[PDB]
Ligand binder design. Structure first.
Ligand SMILES: O=c1c2cnccc2cc2n1CCc1c-2[nH]c2ccccc12
Ligand SMILES: O=c1c2cnccc2cc2n1CCc1c-2[nH]c2ccccc12
Ligand SMILES: [Mg+2]
Ligand SMILES: [Mg+2]
Ligand SMILES: [Mg+2]
Ligand SMILES: [Mg+2]
Ligand SMILES: [Zn+2]
Ligand SMILES: [Zn+2]
Lengths: 372, 567, 567, 372
């Protein structure tokens, strides 16, 4: 009756691509075309590979059968919408696994667990898997996996405006994020075979549940400026990020997932374009359903008069920009020294912004010419 | 006296202090110490007044016929006064001789780590050191008043009990206080007898072998009374010598009464400020003792006792000035203590917090500043995207009609590496000032170099609007420095244009080629100016559309408003 | 020198400054100014050291044979030094003559509105006023260093452009700097020629008609170099007179080289502290010019130029002291700048925030204080509920066995209007100290009157434990004042008892009847002492069970823990 | 089908007691015996009387029929448990109506609405109905009415410990309060005849809903010290309560309901004893159900070994004490001048605490004697 799993646990035909999984520009859609796109098993496979890489199946003694069971039920639960689907969850999972298990120049590593190779002998690069215990990292990974579960395909403001049942059930305060966390944990606790945390203590499980819910709720964009200002006031006027104080580590994981969630305009131009197509298509769907009700069509959600470049430029300038600047002023963005330090992510971000400002200026000028 | 100079083409407060000698050798050689001290106190009043109220410039006519300032300096009493008011002088002052005048350009006093909010020439709150009565400086008076205001009064440990101590021959200040107390209740003094106590934090002794003794008392008594009333109270004896041999002053009856009445008035004229519920007065008691030599009265000795007080006791009103409208005036006691005691007010919501902390500028690019964003990225065809025409709805409206205006703005912003000009129907109203309807619009160009200009446009070929533009630039300077929290040297230049029916030229006024400033007034910063403008507009309750940061993205995301602090 | 006095029965740091004259007339009449200044600097070092490290007491042997202090005072240089270090003297010092010694009881330096964290005799950072080089006082140095640390360096506006100004005959300091610059590159000087510039913030002139000229330079040059390097740099010319007529010093070759080398060493020995990424050094350049009269060389003139620096430049190490373990030592440059620049650390969660702000005490009862709560409201049968035996699980355990202990505690707390004593297995370990196992327990009674006592119990009829109890009381005093943030005068008394096998008496030591304190050390406050104890235990990471506030109610409600700041 | 109302709207037999409703020691249980205790119509009647007193039926043009409909559905919804029942809601409603519409010595009154008589001519007494607009006051009253709706009879910690469904649905963050607000607003929006806010604007309704949810969520005792410390830091170091700034008024209404919720130990000894019996009986029920599951019996919830006096004394000392001190240091507790000002509430609080400390000492001493 319950969704258990596919017959073979770990598939073999999707190899030679999972090994090139430590690159920021991961070819995710090539993998979706690699795995059978009919059923959908991308999130479960990527999760298994990443956990086996981190060795967390040993550091916590987790049974792989129930692990695959739970994550397959999860990925089946993700609605089939254009943007907030299982591919988005896999992307966020990979982005968090990258940001927390890759060399970060100017770090000070101190039952932790490091990535597979990591070639760590020097004293110039640290990884966040050395400053953060294994429990909190597994909590961050699981929270990133189940963070957009059962997404209806709308925004918080839409459900709040039309007074949807799910918006009254949560009193208009982080409607979607609370719904995701609640439904995911409910599905977890539903069956006895999904229980892949069987070898955890009681206090371990309670702290794990707390951290997972915190990470999931931290990805609400209404709290964006609060989180950004708190991170600024903790690495600007304070001593910085004390890797002993647990609130500091919690804030670090929260910001890490906040940035791994919106990472479209920080990859190559092709991946960024595809993610942009997805998000804007979902916006157009919402605009259709919102004109069907007689509500005034929201901004940027009109498939007759799109303003895609305006949307993406405003987004990159107002949300992803200051967030990357805050996350980088604390010296946490992964990079390398040059013979001074080359950060690929900020480079991709700047290039994409410049492309959008080309398109904006070109369209604006042409309209100004023709309109006279 | 000191009077605002209304007939200068500076966009600033220009105080006129009259004639003043200069040069160190001539200030020394000046054969009139009274006039020298008068000139010094006048210049210092002017400087304090300009520090407390935005910026300014002090203008003094060179009195002596021959002055150079490249081979005479300024002086040594003037430098002492300057250094006394200010911590770091070259950060606040700039000296410039312009022909027959000596100008001093004064920055505005800015909140620093000390916590001071104003500058005072002298607090006039005296405190009692171990033996000497000294006046509290700025930080001493600050801590004293803040401590008294914290407890809604001033704590004492009134004699509920003497501490049960061991038995030992110990000597302390309480011994001197008690001996002076028994001296105070003594009924007659043997002329030429020795004292068993000396002066301490509760006992001061004064000789005053003067024939008058009334003017001396009237002029020196308030500072000792304020010293005692501010630390533990004590006794003041007048009539001894420096060797503690009782001598007394040779005065006769019917003079003791007038002298006591003069003491009474001189103490009742002393100010006082209560933080406590009730409002007592300075409790003391005068008394006169005879100094009988053998059977005769060799004179008298005046004994005065002051009790510890509940709150502050000034010797005079505090020396703190400011130019209110014109005719620079001294701060009142309530206003002075309000500036000293009450905190600085600020809310700083998280949105504005990030919009301000976008100004880190560590050794790196740190792109994406949120204050210079604009949606319409296409004005002024031949150019790149480097001038944010801010309001974006007043600018387009104003450029649609008024055909010469767009071409004028393009001609004007050509030689600007990067700036952002901000239009308005009238900046005077936005800065809380009387408006005049003949002005079409205004503007405010804030570039990297080239201190901020204030373009004033109009179509009337009859008037000048020099007064309007100068008043607006003045108030913008003062608002920036005081409310906006800009902590450097600023000067708002000006320009006036004439837009006729198809005439886009005839700049009727260019303030830059009329007035000369020091060298450091020309290199502003263009980002702290934007933050200062943001904060000044917010505190003035007129931050409406400037600094666009469009909200079609927020309204989708769900983020709220960011200002109009009543919600 | 200065050495800790290890053989005094005070529960404090007692510094011994040797012999010291006293009395104002005798300090004046002392026919040796060098010894007087040496004594003054010694006392001031001791006082600064005690201010920086908890409290203390300064002990000096009265040098002159006849001293009273009730008819001689202290002095006038000593009072000047005291008033220079401290803002308000009677709040920090108390003087007491005990036979053949003069004691000074020094409170601990407490954070005030000024923002200072330590006291320094002299920062040794010189700043350049308009014409004179003066040393920065405490608040000036504080603001200077905080400003430099904020920008990770010190900003300049390097000559990218000269401001495009109008044309006018204007005179400014840049004129004097430029004239001195052309003077610096001049190749030969006509003896007895006039200067066209005077001294300003970039130009200092010195005569020095001395035969040696090496010691004078070596002792005066660092302060002018530090003045210039801290504000805009400048030139220093040696060889002129007070009338600007070039004279030069009469020196011959083979002396110029040794003099230049001495200048080099005297500048390279000057400290410096960088907040910037790179670490440059004091860029300057010496040079010697001839003063040719007619065809002969009448002497030489030394021209020295110092460039503006990126960060601080001291003339010597900062005069700031503290007693580390013994043998009072001077603060190091890194530690001094760390105390000055870095903030005060504090978290202050909301639970602890309310547990502290329960100490309002406005003019009203304001009942329900959360720090003196206890569940077991029944100890010591004949009494009311007015002594909170705090730990409630160590106290019951200790009272079950040790039969004499409960009766002893009842005998002891009989004469206490209201207090709260706090037991422990060993207070020495709780205060971060070496333990000794022979002690049974301890205690800490904190009543309204009667300053805090430290009962030390034990059952060994061989030893004394005076050293143990005195060290523990000393460290408790210092911890309260420094870490707990108690801002008044405290003294931790002591008592030692002997609990034999059914013997509950024989107090082997009672510190109150052994030492005499000033009158104000006996009236503590009992609520700020509790807050101070809370904060000190928290910062020491040993706040476990004291201050019960039972949590059977919280665990039901759902409220969390309140301490162990790692979660 | 829906619960509409009793046949007559406002009953008449419960008169001569509703007029003595401006006394802090209101005889609530005498009214429960007055009204028919079988069905239960106390909350609706008290609400009608209080609103008609404030004239809010005119200041907002509300139909009394749908008003009574909604509030009768509400009072029917309140579970029939020993403490958190409709009597508790009526008590909180009356306490808020008292605290906000009675003279407060040392106040500065400035479409407001005042109470019925209020005899306001002097310049010494202000009431909070003059510093707070009518909309916010009606929001506070309605929030106090529906604040313990559908209470299960357990604590937040109990539902969180056993992982009840309603605790997973809200992610263990203010479980009961969110449940109350959500269920009450859901019942309101369910039918078209409950809509007694028909004459409100759109923005008016949105702000009203926001304020009501805020007030309801503010009564969670886990936020007690946060609210108390925030109120301390706003009338101790600041200028005080600026009656113009809306966040100040919001904090004032939140604290007013926080104190009107727990007001048992601030009435006469009889009312206080009855409320204490109720609360402790509910605790005992929870302890029964929690021993039935094998969980360790919580403190104070053991009907075999009660510690009632300990509970009530600890409560009065730790929760109600500091809250009253904070609410009184801001000069908001209603009182009168004496020929200096006599506050009945703090008097009742002190007396009840002294009684409990008598009982504690007596029992403790007797146990110490007998145990030897
Ligand atoms: O342009 C992008 C984008 C571009 N590449 C990748 C991801 C992206 C995600 C988003 N947007 C802008 C709109 C939006 C996005 N996440 C939201 C969440 C809530 C409400 C609105 C939004
Ligand atoms: O003693 C009383 C009391 C006494 N008179 C009136 C009301 C009262 C309400 C409460 N208590 C203590 C326990 C408790 C109460 N409300 C809660 C809410 C949540 C968790 C625990 C509690
Ligand atoms: Mg989401
Ligand atoms: Mg997401
Ligand atoms: Mg509740
Ligand atoms: Mg309730
Ligand atoms: Zn007073
Ligand atoms: Zn440096």
């Amino acid at each position: 009756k319950p969704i258990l799993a596919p017959e073979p646990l770990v598939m073999d035909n999707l190899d030679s691509i999972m090994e090139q999984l430590n690159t920021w520009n991961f070819p995710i859609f090539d993998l979706v075309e690699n795995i059978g796109r009919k059923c959908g098993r991308i999130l479960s496979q990527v999760s298994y590979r990443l956990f086996e890489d981190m060795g967390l199946f040993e550091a916590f003694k987790i049974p792989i059968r129930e692990f695959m069971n739970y994550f397959h039920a999860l990925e089946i639960g993700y609605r089939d919408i254009p943007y907030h689907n299982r591919i988005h969850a896999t992307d966020v999972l990979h982005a968090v696994w990258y940001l927390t298990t890759q060399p970060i120049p100017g770090l000070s590593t101190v039952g932790y667990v490091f990535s597979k190779t990591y070639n760590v002998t020097d004293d110039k690069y640290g990884c966040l898997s050395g400053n953060i215990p294994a429990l909190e990292l597994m909590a961050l990974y699981v929270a990133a996996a189940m963070h957009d579960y059962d997404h209806p395909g709308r925004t918080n403001a839409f459900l709040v405006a039309t007074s949807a049942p799910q918006a009254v059930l949560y009193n208009d305060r982080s409607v979607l994020e609370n719904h995701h966390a609640a439904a995911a944990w409910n599905l977890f606790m539903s069956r006895p075979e999904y229980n892949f945390l069987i070898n955890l203590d009681h206090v371990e499980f309670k702290h794990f549940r707390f951290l997972v819910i915190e990470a999931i709720l931290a990805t609400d964009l209404k709290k964006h400026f609060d989180f950004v200002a708190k991170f600024n006031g903790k690495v600007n006027d304070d001593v910085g990020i004390d890797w002993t104080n647990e609130n500091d580590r919690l804030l670090v994981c929260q910001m890490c997932i906040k940035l791994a969630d919106i990472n479209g305009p920080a990859k190559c131009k092709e991946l960024h374009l595809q993610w942009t197509d997805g998000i804007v298509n979902e916006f157009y769907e919402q605009g259709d359903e919102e004109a069907s009700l007689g509500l005034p069509i929201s901004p940027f959600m009109d498939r007759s008069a799109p303003q895609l470049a305006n949307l993406q430029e405003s987004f990159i300038s107002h949300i992803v920009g200051p967030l990357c600047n805050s996350y980088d002023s604390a010296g946490l963005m992964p990079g390398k020294w040059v013979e001074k330090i080359y950060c690929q992510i900020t480079q991709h971000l700047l290039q994409n912004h410049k492309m959008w400002k080309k398109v904006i200026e070109e369209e604006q000028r042409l309209a100004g010419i023709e309109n006279q | 006296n000191i009077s605002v100079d209304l007939e200068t083409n500076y966009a600033e407060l220009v105080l006129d202090v009259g004639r003043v000698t200069l040069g160190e050798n001539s200030r020394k050689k000046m054969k009139d110490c009274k006039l020298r001290k008068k000139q010094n106190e006048s210049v210092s009043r002017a400087m304090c007044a300009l520090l407390n109220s935005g910026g300014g410039v002090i203008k003094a006519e060179i009195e002596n016929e021959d002055y150079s300032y490249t081979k005479d300096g300024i002086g040594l009493d003037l430098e002492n006064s300057f250094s006394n008011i200010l911590l770091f002088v070259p950060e606040y002052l700039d000296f410039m001789q312009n022909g027959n005048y000596f100008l001093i350009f004064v920055k505005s006093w800015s909140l620093n780590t000390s916590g001071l909010r104003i500058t005072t020439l002298s607090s006039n709150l005296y405190k009692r050191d171990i033996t000497s009565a000294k006046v509290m400086n700025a930080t001493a008076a600050l801590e004293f008043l803040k401590d008294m205001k914290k407890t809604r009064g001033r704590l004492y440990l009134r004699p509920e009990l003497l501490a049960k101590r061991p038995c030992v021959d110990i000597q302390e200040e309480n011994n001197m206080k008690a001996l002076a107390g028994v001296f105070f209740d003594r009924t007659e003094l043997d002329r030429k007898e020795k004292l068993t106590f000396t002066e301490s934090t509760h006992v001061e002794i004064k000789n005053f072998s003067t024939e008058r003794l009334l003017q001396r008392i009237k002029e020196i008594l308030p500072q000792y009374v304020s010293a005692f009333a501010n630390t533990d109270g004590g006794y003041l004896f007048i009539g001894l010598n420096e060797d503690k041999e009782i001598i007394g002053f040779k005065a006769e009856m019917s003079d003791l009464d007038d002298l006591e009445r003069e003491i009474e008035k001189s103490i009742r004229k002393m100010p006082v400020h209560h933080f406590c519920m009730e409002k007592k007065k300075i409790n003391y008691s005068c008394k006169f003792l005879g100094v009988y030599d053998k059977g005769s009265l060799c004179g008298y000795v005046c004994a005065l006792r002051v009790e510890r007080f509940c709150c502050a006791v000034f010797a005079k009103e505090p020396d703190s000035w400011h130019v209110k409208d014109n005719r620079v005036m001294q701060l009142t006691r309530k206003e002075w203590i309000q500036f000293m005691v009450e905190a600085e007010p600020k809310f700083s919501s998280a949105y504005e917090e990030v919009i301000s902390q976008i100004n880190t500028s560590l050794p790196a690019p740190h792109s994406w500043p949120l204050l210079e964003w604009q949606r319409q990225r296409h004005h002024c065809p031949g150019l790149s995207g480097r001038i944010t025409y801010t309001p974006e709805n007043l600018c387009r409206k104003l450029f649609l009609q008024h055909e010469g205006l767009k071409q004028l703005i393009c001609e004007e912003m050509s030689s600007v590496r990067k700036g952002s000009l901000i239009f308005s129907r009238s900046w005077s109203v936005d800065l809380g000032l009387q408006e005049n309807h003949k002005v079409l619009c205004d503007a405010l160009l804030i570039s990297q170099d080239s201190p901020p200009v204030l373009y004033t446009f109009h179509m009337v070929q009859d008037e000048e609007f020099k007064g309007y533009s100068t008043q607006t630039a003045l108030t913008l300077k003062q608002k920036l420095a005081k409310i906006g929290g800009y902590t450097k040297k600023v000067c708002v230049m000006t320009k006036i244009f004439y837009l006729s029916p198809e005439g886009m030229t005839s700049c009727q006024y260019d303030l830059r080629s009329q007035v000369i400033y020091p060298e450091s007034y020309y290199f502003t910063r263009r980002k702290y100016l934007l933050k200062a403008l943001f904060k000044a507009l917010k505190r003035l309750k007129s931050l409406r559309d400037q600094f666009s940061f469009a909200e079609n993205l927020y309204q989708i995301i769900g983020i709220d408003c960011f200002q109009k602090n009543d919600k």
